[PDB]
Symmetry: D2
């Protein structure tokens, strides 16, 4: 039992599935995919701020007087195949998939009763995208997360509440709470990814009451996790796990379960038609951030943006499949692992540490030129074995008294290494 206050809500232990999942896939999909230009913040940058480049794009691409709601019918999504998406996510090694159900534009990706003619069923796809994706993911035993944005940029009731100093709660009682309850009662989410909370306190958003209901009387009360974006000054302070800031890259080990959210497109979470090759994050950088995040006790949430036709572009597929290929070899050092006592060597070639049971995994991203890996932190016992995940056969190792351990790496010819950018050394019987 939990009471509608933060000290009680924060005492709820997180279900173990989230910490054992490690890797997840983020999907930013909505009406902003129709312009597919700039970012998913298109509407705010165009009308909220009146940026000249967005106005020029609107002038040169659409008739005068074109409004954002006119994008609604053009969100056809006629090539949407949730089974293909789920197969790709399974091949990528993802253990959970978080889909944006409603972004700051206010367009719900499910038939919301309080979003009539501004949802995916009434206009655009004419489908229940949330339900179809959830069915496809549940058939493959992949955990489901629903991203929900609390605020809406131009919703009249939210604007009225903002004018009133957020003393009234017309928007919260009309749209926010009914939509959250509908999203929880149906589709039975495993994860809730809240957003759009930087403008109002948690008292206005009714976050504590909804969280108490979710933890007490909801159909998913047991195996559900939420992030920290439930109001002003609530980020990285209150909630299940801490997203804190976007693309969070902590230096030291945090004392709370956290998650890193990053996008393959470095300049937009939503799809961009004119994405350059230099705007796509490299597979070496993606695997590197994942290794650092898992080593520091965090979850890795990689974002892709589907097109307005419901397609995932081949470059995103290539990145995801490379991540999955790397994971098919090095998963036992990632999935259901916990941080070690050091988590990285401060004197070697970028070595990070994970631990599972009695096994210690050293994931290194740079192959030493001289062919011997130096590991100062591990303490060798008489039953120490080096494995080099992906290669059958033990490795030669010498324990220097004054210096650290020295592991003789297998000198493999080109086009024979198991992975291409990061390698894992497994140590058994090491303190």
């Amino acid at each position: 039992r939990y009471t509608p206050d933060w000290p009680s809500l924060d005492s709820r232990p997180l279900p173990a599935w989230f910490d054992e999942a490690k890797f997840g896939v983020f999907i930013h999909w909505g009406v902003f995919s129709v312009p597919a230009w700039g970012s998913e913040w298109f509407w705010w940058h165009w009308q909220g701020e009146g940026r000249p480049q967005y106005q020029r794009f609107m002038r040169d691409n659409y008739p005068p007087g074109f409004s954002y709601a006119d994008f609604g019918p053009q969100f056809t999504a006629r090539f949407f195949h949730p089974e293909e998406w789920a197969d790709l996510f399974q091949a990528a090694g993802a253990k959970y998939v978080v889909l944006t159900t409603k972004h700051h534009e206010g367009f719900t990706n499910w038939p919301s009763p309080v979003s009539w003619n501004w949802n995916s069923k009434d206009v655009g796809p004419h489908r229940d995208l949330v339900g179809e994706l959830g069915t496809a993911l549940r058939k493959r035993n992949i955990r489901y997360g629903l991203y929900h944005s609390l605020l809406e940029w131009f919703h009249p009731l939210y604007l009225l509440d903002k004018k009133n100093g957020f003393k009234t709660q017309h928007f919260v009682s009309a749209k926010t709470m009914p939509e959250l309850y509908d999203l929880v009662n149906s589709y039975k989410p495993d994860l809730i990814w809240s957003d759009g909370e930087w403008e109002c306190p948690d008292t206005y958003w009714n976050s504590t009451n909804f969280l108490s209901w979710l933890y007490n009387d909801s159909p998913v009360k047991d195996e559900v996790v939420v992030n920290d974006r439930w109001g002003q000054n609530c980020s990285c302070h209150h909630g299940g796990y801490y997203n804190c800031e976007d693309k969070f890259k902590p230096q030291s080990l945090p004392d709370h379960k956290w998650e890193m959210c990053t996008s393959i497109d470095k300049f937009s979470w939503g799809y961009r038609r004119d994405m350059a090759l230099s705007d796509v994050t490299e597979e070496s950088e993606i695997i590197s951030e994942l290794v650092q995040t898992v080593s520091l006790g965090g979850n890795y949430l990689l974002n892709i943006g589907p097109t307005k036709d419901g397609l995932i572009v081949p470059i995103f597929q290539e990145r995801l499949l490379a991540v999955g290929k790397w994971l098919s070899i090095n998963g036992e050092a990632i999935y259901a692992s916990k941080p070690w006592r050091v988590q990285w060597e401060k004197n070697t070639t970028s070595v990070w540490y994970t631990s599972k049971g009695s096994a210690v995994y050293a994931i290194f991203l740079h192959w030493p030129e001289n062919g011997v890996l130096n590991l100062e932190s591990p303490i060798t016992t008489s039953t120490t074995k080096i494995t080099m995940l992906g290669i059958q056969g033990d490795l030669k190792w010498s324990t220097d008294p004054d210096k650290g351990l020295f592991i003789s790496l297998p000198q493999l010819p080109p086009s024979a290494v198991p992975a291409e950018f990061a390698w894992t050394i497994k140590l058994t019987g090491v303190k």
Copy 2:
């Protein structure tokens, strides 16, 4: 002061402007003008009943999966000129203009806060049609009426209330009452034309409370009139004036102020692109219904349907201008008139009676072949004068003792009569 009950509300006397206005113009305009096929009931006939002809039209005219909300962006209304509309309505002799602010499709023709992205400001015209038309009409001193449909066919909250036996009032508190209050507080209507009430009792619609507020604390509390469509079994029983049934044609004189609503297009209140010439009501039939309605103490509300571009087609303009030309001659027998003691001769060639002050007007629609008009009802005094509105000069008349009065009509050559289908005889000093 009025209480929220029908006996108190019905005791409010109607302001005299409505009874003195006589002639009004009805405007059915909305998203249904985009298909412009069948009727303004397109959405219900297509999805509510699944009529094969509407499905065939959708198949042959639009891509598969096309939804009604996809019509929203196509309601461009780029040729809308409210000043031209108001000038035409003034030329037609109309004293009040009633515009549909929101029909059963739920699309509001003003920026309604509770109709986000389903209003004329957010999608389609990108204008405030109600406000622009009201400004244009007020500049010309024409009374303004707002048509509001209580029900919406496919609104999720209305469907939920219908499923619950109309015991809940989610739709009323979410959409209906806020929209009515917004429509009254802004645009300050002179008339409220309610509709969409045949499915629910007046208790569900909160009609008595809204009417008490309108009559007590509203900005238009003095000079406002409402019709009788405020709930089930409320038509022709409760309200300001009685529309009763559409195209109401009573035989005897009603004891309550009433209004006849008729459409120039006999098969649709909304605009139809494939309107035939045989579907357009003739000017002789329009003038005839107006004369009968005014004689029987009623108001005449003639309906036109603008195109999705905001244009009134030349045939509707021709009908309205013919009605205005007839009124420029015979207005003093219509405007600010009251029914006489007979209201029609039961033995002559379709003669109807109006009265203003001491003057009695006999409007006849059939020119007698023999050239003498027989009037049994009037009682002639020694100061009796026959005028024949539109022609200067008295008329010869003989009072038969056993029979009635015989008026010698002016034998005019062709292309010399003032009007073309109905003529007015003015009698002064007649009991």
Copy 3:
């Protein structure tokens, strides 16, 4: 046998069907119906001259960079019913119908082999409009005329010929002659209405050779008529009949068969969406021009403009049906008639004269106030009878020695006259 020179071609007698037809209907239909703004000269006024109003219309109604060819796919014509058109034309009293097969825009309304992807079959309607209309008209025994514009404003080959001083004939051999031969060999026209000839001499257009082929070896060599627009300085000088100038209104009787072409819309031959009621020619003015044209030995060609959906608007239907109603009464004074020796009274109330056999018809457009019609021209014999077409029964008439004939008109009550704007007096046994 005829030689390719004007003196030989002009000696061909016209088939009698054209002179006996009298009344015809002109149809201007094409891609210019899609903008439906300004006139059928939209493309030239917009790009040829760069008029600011057309550029403003393009800016406010279509995305930037929109070209005229982009109008092609929008010419859907999905409500085109040629049987309905032919029934309306039969009801209007039309004896021939002339349809624009290709205007100055170059868009052919039939599958022209030399107009690939710029014809009605390839884009837009996806139909053979010329063939369908011809089939519908031939089923009702209505004569068929094909309007063909020689020039095209922006065709590259025509522009090249114009640059070369019209010394080359690339456009004529590539487009003009093959299209004329295809239009004659198929659809077997009864009439050819040439246009677009004011820029080049008849030598450039190969007019004499095509006309010699048409009169010698064509499938319609016997019953075919052509107008006078076959080159520079060819109008009203060379050809079958003389259109001379548009809306030609001669004062005296011409010595050659001529035709008056006029449009119901006074400011456009093509359809205009924003047509005003004041822009529509009145039925009194239409009947008046027809009476004057037939009296002076001419044919009357009335023009209508269908919408881009293939619909004839109700106002055009009303005008045509009024003309047909007038003709159902006064046809025997029009069809297969010839001009008399006077053709109009120079001292009476606008009386025009036709003659058929021994019968002389006096069509008057103004009803005399005193009720007696004065006719100075006719010479009365002892077997003279006045008929007053539309009314059974002879008329009283007195022959003044010094003055002319005086006919006592029937004093009809209102709503009893046969026609409404023009009346015909039939005289038998009159010199």
Copy 4:
């Protein structure tokens, strides 16, 4: 001087630029990019053969009656930046770029006088794509090739010629020859890539006369090359160089200059919106085919398909940039090289031979596991040096008397090799 016959035309020596260019980029771009489904043969597969899948796609994606020409206005190409394209092609190492000016659909990508309203200037892009791309490529000193398809699937004149047994030449004189002359006189192509010739003999296509004019009196008569697709049975028999069959992979060394044309998308030369990652040719396979083609004395033409918006998708950019990165290291073994006397080792790990001057390059695609490369073919002299292109420093080598040469490869650690899939050994002073 050359005469219009094949023995004279085939005797013309090819300019050296084509043989020294080696690597080129093919661009398939046109109206077929608008559907972006199936292949660039969309129109023929949909209407020519009536394949059920294409009909289903048309039914589910476009309104009924939609025609291929209706795709024309949708070819907006609003993100076309030829400078970016040329920069990418320069970065990819391409020495010539061949753009499709007109495919079998008949849509010309330049303002063709004989393709009015079916060209890129009149509809769609409203630009001269050929001219803009040519300007961008010429600024960077990249050779320009124009792909021209002789036949058009549904052009009426071509169909008429086919019906007549190709005895008439209406299509050739109306469209083919004028378009070829316009494409040569303007844009001054360096290469002509003919296609669409498998249906008619070279006599019908007038190929010999056009080629004699091109080689004698054209502005590009000196430095111009053409392929072998100039008529029936002309492929791989007549012309400048031999494309023979698409994706030609000869086993032995041909005796004539040839070119391999291959597409990154294995199932379409045109862009496909639903391209899968498995449909994209791998960079290892692309580099492998290029090495085999250059070794066997051929040119490598890699094809990409831009979107209807004028964009090259990031996966195509990645492939091209990987090819360019490989070439920045191994270019001196490719550019301006000639085949050696062996061209491949028949007993080693896929070694191919090129030669430049006195230097012999052995390009191997498989790294030997034991680290020593065996080369039987080369004959070692006392001044023999092994270089291993990309690595500074000679290599140890031992000449076995009975066996071949054995080169000690540099044992490089992972993430230190110059290339990733193919390596080049340079031998100096070797017979």
